PDB file of C-alpha atoms and ligand atoms in Angstrom:
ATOM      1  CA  UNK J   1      60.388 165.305 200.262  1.00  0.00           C
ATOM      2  CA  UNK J   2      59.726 161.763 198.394  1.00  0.00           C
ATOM      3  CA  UNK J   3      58.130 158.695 198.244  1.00  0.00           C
ATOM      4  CA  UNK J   4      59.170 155.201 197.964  1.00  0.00           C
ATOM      5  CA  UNK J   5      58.308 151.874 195.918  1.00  0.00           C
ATOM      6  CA  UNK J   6      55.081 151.358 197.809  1.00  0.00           C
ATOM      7  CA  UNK J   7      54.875 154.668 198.976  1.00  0.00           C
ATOM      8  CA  UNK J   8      55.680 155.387 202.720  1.00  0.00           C
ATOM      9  CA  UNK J   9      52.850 155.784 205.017  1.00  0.00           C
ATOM     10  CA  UNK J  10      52.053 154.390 208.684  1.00  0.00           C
ATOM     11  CA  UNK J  11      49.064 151.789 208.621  1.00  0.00           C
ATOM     12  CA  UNK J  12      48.226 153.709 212.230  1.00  0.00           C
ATOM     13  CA  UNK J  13      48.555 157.516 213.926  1.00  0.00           C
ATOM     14  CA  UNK J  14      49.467 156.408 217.054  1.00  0.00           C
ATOM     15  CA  UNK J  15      52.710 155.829 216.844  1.00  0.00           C
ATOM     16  CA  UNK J  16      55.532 155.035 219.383  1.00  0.00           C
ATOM     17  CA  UNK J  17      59.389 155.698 219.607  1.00  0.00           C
ATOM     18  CA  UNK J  18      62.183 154.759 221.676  1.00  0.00           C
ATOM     19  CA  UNK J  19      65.618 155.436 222.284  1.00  0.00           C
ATOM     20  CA  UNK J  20      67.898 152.365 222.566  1.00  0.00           C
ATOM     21  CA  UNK J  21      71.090 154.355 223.725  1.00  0.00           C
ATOM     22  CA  UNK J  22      72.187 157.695 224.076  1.00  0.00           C
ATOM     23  CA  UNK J  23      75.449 159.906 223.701  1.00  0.00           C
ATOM     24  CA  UNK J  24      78.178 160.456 226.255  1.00  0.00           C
ATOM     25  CA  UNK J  25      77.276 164.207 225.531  1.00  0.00           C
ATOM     26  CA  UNK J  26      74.095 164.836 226.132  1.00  0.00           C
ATOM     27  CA  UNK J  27      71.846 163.594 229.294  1.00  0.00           C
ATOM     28  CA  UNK J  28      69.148 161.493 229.274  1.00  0.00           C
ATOM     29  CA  UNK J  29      65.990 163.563 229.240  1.00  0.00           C
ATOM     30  CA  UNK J  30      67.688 166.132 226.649  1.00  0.00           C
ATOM     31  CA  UNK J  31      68.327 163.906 224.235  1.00  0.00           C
ATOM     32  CA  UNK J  32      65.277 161.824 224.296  1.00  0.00           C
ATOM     33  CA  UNK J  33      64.113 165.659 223.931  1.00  0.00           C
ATOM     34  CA  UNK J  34      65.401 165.695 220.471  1.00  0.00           C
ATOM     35  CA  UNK J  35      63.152 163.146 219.448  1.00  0.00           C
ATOM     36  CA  UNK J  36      60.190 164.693 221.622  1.00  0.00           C
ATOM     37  CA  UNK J  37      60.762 167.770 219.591  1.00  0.00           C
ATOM     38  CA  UNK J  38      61.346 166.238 215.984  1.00  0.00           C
ATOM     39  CA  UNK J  39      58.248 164.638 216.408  1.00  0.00           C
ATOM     40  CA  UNK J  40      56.350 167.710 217.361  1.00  0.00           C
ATOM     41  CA  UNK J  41      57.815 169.184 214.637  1.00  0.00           C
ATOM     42  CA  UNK J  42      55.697 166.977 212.453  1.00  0.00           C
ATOM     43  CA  UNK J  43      53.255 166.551 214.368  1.00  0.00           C
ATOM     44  CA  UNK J  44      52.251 170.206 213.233  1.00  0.00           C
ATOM     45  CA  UNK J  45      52.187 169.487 210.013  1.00  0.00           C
ATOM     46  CA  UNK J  46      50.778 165.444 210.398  1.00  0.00           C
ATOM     47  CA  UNK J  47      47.489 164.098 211.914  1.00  0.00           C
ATOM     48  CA  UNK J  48      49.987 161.640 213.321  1.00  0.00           C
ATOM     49  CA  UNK J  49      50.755 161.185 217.047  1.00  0.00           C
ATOM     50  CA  UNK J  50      53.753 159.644 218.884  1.00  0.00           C
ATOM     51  CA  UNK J  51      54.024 157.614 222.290  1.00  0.00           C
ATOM     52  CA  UNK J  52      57.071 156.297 224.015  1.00  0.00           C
ATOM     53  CA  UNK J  53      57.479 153.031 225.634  1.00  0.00           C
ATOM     54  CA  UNK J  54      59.802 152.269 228.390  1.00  0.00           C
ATOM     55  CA  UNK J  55      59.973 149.173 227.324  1.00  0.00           C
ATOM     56  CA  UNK J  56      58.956 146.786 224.251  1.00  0.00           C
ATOM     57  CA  UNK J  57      59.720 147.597 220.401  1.00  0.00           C
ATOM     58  CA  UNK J  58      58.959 150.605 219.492  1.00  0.00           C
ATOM     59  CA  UNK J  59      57.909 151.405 215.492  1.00  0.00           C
ATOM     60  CA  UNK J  60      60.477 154.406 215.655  1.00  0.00           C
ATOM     61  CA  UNK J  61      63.053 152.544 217.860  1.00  0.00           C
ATOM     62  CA  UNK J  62      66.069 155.228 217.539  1.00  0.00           C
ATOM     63  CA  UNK J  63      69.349 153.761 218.339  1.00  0.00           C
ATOM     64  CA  UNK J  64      72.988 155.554 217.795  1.00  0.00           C
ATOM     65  CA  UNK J  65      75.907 154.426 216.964  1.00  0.00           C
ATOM     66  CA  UNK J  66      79.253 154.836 215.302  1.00  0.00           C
ATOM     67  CA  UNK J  67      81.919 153.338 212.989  1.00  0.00           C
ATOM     68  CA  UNK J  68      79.988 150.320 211.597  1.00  0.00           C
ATOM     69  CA  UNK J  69      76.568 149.198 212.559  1.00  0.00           C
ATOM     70  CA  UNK J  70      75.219 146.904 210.395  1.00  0.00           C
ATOM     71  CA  UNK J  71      74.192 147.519 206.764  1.00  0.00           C
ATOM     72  CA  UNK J  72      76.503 149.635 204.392  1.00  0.00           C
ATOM     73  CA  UNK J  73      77.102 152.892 205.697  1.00  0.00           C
ATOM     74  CA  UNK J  74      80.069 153.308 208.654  1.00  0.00           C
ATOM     75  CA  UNK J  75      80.211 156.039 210.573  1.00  0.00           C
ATOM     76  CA  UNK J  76      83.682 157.851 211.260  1.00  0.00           C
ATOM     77  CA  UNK J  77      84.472 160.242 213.676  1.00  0.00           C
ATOM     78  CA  UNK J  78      83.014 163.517 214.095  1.00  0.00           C
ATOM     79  CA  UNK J  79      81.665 165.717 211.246  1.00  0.00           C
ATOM     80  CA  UNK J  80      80.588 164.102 208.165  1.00  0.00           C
ATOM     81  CA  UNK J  81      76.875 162.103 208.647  1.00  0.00           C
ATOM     82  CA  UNK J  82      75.708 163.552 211.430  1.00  0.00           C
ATOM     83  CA  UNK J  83      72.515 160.913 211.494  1.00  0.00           C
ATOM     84  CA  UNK J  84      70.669 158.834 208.925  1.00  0.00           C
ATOM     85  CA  UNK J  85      67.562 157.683 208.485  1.00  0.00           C
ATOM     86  CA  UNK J  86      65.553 155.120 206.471  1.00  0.00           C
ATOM     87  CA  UNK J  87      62.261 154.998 205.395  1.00  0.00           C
ATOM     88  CA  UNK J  88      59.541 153.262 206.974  1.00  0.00           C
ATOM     89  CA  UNK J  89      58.881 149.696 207.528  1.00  0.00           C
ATOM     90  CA  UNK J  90      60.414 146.975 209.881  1.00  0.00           C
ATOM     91  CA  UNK J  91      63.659 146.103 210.074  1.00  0.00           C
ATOM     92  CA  UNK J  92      66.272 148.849 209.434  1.00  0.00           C
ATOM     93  CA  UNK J  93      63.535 150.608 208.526  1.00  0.00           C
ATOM     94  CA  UNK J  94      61.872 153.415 210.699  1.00  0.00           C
ATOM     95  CA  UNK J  95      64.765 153.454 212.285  1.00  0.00           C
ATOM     96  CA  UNK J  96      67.060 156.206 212.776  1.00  0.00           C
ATOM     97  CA  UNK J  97      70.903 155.890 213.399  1.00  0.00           C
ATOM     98  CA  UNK J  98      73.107 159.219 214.775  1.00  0.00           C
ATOM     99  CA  UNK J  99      76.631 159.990 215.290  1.00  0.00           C
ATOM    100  CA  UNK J 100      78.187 158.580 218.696  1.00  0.00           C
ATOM    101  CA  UNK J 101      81.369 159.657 217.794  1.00  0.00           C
ATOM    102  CA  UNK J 102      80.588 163.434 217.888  1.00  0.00           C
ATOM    103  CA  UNK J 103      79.498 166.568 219.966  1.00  0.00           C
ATOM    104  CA  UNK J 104      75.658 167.197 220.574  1.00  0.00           C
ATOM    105  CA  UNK J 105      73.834 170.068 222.462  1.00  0.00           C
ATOM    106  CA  UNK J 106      70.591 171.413 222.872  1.00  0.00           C
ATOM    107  CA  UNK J 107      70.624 174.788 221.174  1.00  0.00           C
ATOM    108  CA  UNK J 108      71.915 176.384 218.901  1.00  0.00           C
ATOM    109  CA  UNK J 109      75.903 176.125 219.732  1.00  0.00           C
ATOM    110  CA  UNK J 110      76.857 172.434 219.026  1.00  0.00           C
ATOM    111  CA  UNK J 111      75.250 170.396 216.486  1.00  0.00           C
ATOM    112  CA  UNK J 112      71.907 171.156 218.035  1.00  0.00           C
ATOM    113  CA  UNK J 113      70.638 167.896 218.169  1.00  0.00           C
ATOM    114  CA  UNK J 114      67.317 167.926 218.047  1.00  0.00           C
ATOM    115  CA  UNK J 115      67.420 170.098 214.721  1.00  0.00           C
ATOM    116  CA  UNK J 116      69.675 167.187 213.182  1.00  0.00           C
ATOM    117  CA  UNK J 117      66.574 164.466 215.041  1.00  0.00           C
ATOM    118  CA  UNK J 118      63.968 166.515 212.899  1.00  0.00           C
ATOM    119  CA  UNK J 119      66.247 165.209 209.877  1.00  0.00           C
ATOM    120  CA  UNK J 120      66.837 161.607 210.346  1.00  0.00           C
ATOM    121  CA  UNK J 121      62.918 161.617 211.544  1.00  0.00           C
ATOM    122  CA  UNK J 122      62.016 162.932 208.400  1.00  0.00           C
ATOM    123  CA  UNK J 123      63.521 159.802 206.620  1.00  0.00           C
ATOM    124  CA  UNK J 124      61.931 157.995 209.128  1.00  0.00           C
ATOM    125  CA  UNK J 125      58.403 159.448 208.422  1.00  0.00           C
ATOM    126  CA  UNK J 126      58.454 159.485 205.009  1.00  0.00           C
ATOM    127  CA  UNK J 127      60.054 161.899 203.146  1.00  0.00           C
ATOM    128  CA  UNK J 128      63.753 162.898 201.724  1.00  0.00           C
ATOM    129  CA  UNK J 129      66.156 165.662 200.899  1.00  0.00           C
ATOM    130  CA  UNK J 130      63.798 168.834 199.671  1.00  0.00           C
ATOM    131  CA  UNK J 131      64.160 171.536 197.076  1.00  0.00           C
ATOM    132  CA  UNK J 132      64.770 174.387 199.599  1.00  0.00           C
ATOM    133  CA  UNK J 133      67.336 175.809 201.552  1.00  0.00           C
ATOM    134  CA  UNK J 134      65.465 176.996 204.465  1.00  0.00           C
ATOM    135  CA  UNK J 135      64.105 173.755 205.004  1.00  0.00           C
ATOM    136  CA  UNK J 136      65.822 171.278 207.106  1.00  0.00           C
ATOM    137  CA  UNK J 137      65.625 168.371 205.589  1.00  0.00           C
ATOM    138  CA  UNK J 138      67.803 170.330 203.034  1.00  0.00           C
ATOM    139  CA  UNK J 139      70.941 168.297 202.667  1.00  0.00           C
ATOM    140  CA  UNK J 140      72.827 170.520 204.554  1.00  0.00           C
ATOM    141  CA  UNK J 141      72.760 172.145 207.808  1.00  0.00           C
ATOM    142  CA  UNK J 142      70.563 175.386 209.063  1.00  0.00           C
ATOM    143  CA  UNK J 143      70.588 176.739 211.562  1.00  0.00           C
ATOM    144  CA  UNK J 144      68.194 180.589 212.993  1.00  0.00           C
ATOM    145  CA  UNK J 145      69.430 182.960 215.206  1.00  0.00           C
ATOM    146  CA  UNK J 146      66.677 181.168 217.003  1.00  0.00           C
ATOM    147  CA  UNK J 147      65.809 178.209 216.771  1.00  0.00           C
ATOM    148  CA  UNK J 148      62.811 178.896 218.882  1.00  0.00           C
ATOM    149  CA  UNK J 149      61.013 179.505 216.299  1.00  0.00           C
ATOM    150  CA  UNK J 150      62.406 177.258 213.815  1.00  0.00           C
ATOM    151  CA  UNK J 151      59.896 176.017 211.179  1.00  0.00           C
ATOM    152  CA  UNK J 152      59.733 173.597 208.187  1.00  0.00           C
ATOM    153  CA  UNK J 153      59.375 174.990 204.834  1.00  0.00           C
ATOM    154  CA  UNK J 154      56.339 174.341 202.365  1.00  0.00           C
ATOM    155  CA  UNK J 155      58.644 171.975 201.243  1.00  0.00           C
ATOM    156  CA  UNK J 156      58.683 169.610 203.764  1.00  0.00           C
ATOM    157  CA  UNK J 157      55.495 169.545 204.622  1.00  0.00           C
ATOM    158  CA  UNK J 158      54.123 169.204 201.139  1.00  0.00           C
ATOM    159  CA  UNK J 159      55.245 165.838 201.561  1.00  0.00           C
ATOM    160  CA  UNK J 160      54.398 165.000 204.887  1.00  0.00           C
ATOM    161  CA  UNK J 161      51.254 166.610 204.237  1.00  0.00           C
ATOM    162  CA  UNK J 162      50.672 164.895 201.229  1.00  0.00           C
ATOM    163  CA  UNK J 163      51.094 161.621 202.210  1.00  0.00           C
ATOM    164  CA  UNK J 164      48.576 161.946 205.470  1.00  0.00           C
ATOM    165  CA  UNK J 165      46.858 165.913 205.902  1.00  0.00           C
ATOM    166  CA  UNK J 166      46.133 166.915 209.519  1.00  0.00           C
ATOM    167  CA  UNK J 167      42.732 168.038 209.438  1.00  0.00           C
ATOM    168  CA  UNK J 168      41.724 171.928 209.614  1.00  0.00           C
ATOM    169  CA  UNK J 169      41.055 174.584 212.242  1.00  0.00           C
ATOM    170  CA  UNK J 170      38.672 173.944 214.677  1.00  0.00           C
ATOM    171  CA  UNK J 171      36.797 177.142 214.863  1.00  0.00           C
ATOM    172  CA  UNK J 172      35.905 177.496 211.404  1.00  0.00           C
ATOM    173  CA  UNK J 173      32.506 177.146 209.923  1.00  0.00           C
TER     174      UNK J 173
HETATM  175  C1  8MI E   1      73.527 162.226 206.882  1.00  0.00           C
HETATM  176  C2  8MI E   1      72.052 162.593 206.618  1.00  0.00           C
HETATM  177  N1  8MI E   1      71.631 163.613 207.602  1.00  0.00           N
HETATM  178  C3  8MI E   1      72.186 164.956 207.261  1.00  0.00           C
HETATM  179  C4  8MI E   1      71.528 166.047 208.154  1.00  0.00           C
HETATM  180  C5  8MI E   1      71.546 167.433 207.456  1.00  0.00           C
HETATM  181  C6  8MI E   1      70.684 168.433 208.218  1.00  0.00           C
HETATM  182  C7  8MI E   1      70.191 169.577 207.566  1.00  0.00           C
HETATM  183  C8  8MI E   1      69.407 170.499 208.267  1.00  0.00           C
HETATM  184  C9  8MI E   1      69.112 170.286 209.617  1.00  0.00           C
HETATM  185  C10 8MI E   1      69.600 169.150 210.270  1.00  0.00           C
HETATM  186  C11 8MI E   1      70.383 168.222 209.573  1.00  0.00           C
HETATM  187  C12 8MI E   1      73.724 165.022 207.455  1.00  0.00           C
HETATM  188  O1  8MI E   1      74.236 164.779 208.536  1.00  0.00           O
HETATM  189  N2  8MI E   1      74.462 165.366 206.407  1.00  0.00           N
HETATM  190  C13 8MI E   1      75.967 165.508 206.445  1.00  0.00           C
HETATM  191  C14 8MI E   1      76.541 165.220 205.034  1.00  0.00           C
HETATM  192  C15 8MI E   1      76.652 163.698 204.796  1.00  0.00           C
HETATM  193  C16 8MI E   1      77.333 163.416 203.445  1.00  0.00           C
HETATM  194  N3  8MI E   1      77.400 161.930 203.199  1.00  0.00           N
HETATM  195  C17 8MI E   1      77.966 161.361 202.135  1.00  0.00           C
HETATM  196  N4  8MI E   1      78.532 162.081 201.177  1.00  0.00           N
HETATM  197  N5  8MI E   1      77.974 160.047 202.041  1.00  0.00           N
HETATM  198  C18 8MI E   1      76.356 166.940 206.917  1.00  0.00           C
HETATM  199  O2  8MI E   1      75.657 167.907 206.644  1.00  0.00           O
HETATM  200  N6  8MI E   1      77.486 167.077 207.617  1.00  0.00           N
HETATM  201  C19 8MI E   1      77.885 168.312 208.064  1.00  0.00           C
HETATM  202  C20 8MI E   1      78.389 168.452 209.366  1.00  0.00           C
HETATM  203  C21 8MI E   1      78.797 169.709 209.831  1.00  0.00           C
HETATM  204  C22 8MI E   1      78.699 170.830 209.000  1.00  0.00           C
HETATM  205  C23 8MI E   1      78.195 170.698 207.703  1.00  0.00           C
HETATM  206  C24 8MI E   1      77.786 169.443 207.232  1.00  0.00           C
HETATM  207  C25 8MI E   1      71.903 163.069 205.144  1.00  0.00           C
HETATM  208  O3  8MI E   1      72.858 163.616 204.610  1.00  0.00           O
HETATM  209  O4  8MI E   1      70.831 162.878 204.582  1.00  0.00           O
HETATM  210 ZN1   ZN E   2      72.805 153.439 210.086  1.00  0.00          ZN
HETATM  211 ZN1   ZN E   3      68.816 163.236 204.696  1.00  0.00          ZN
END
């Protein structure tokens, strides 16, 4: 996890997303799932909540695409940059870019998709490559016999954590 020159943080909770495109891979729902799942992901580990809008902008407006799009950093084929991610703000940032030009699934087979949306969302959020293996915002892929129960490490969310803090149990005191 990591900051940024200004340090990365959401003025609001409520959030919103959107999907401008999708994969010839993958239907609709399923991969729009990916997203649904990343951000539960964090949502377990963030006050924050997330909302999607059929139409409009969207703060977390994921789009895909391959070869260039914009910026510096052309995609190529399959492999390689599987999805990237900036950090927050307007513009190219929040936003989240994955790779067109390659296989997706929804379990653990291809490269499950959602577990590479829980990356790129990560940049989007507000944090970067962590000191741990196990987590998957490692820069490298991991996978679980199953993924079911997949998980963050402590050190992802010590960053997403530490830049916002869900609030405690419930039942307690
Ligand atoms: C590209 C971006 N996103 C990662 C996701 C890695 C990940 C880990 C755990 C769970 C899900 C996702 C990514 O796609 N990384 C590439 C490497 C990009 C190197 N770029 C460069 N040198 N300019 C990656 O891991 N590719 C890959 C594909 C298949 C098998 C193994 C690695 C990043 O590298 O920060
Ligand atoms: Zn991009
Ligand atoms: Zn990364």
């Amino acid at each position: 996890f990591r900051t940024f020159p200004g340090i990365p943080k959401w003025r609001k909770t409520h959030l919103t997303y959107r999907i401008v495109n999708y994969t010839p891979d993958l239907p609709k729902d399923a991969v729009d799932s990916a997203v649904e799942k990343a951000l539960k992901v964090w949502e377990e580990v963030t006050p924050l909540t997330f909302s999607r809008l059929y139409e409009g902008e969207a703060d977390i407006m994921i789009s895909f695409a391959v070869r260039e799009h914009g910026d510096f950093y052309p995609f190529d084929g399959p492999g390689n940059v599987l999805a990237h991610a900036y950090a927050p703000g307007p513009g190219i940032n929040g936003d989240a870019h994955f790779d067109d030009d390659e296989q997706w699934t929804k379990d653990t087979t291809g490269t499950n998709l959602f577990l590479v949306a829980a990356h790129e969302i990560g940049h989007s959020l507000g944090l970067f490559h962590s000191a741990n293996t196990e987590a998957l915002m490692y820069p490298l892929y991991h996978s679980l016999t199953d993924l079911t129960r997949f998980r963050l490490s402590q050190d992802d969310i010590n960053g997403i954590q530490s830049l916002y803090g869900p609030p405690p149990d419930s039942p307690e005191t």
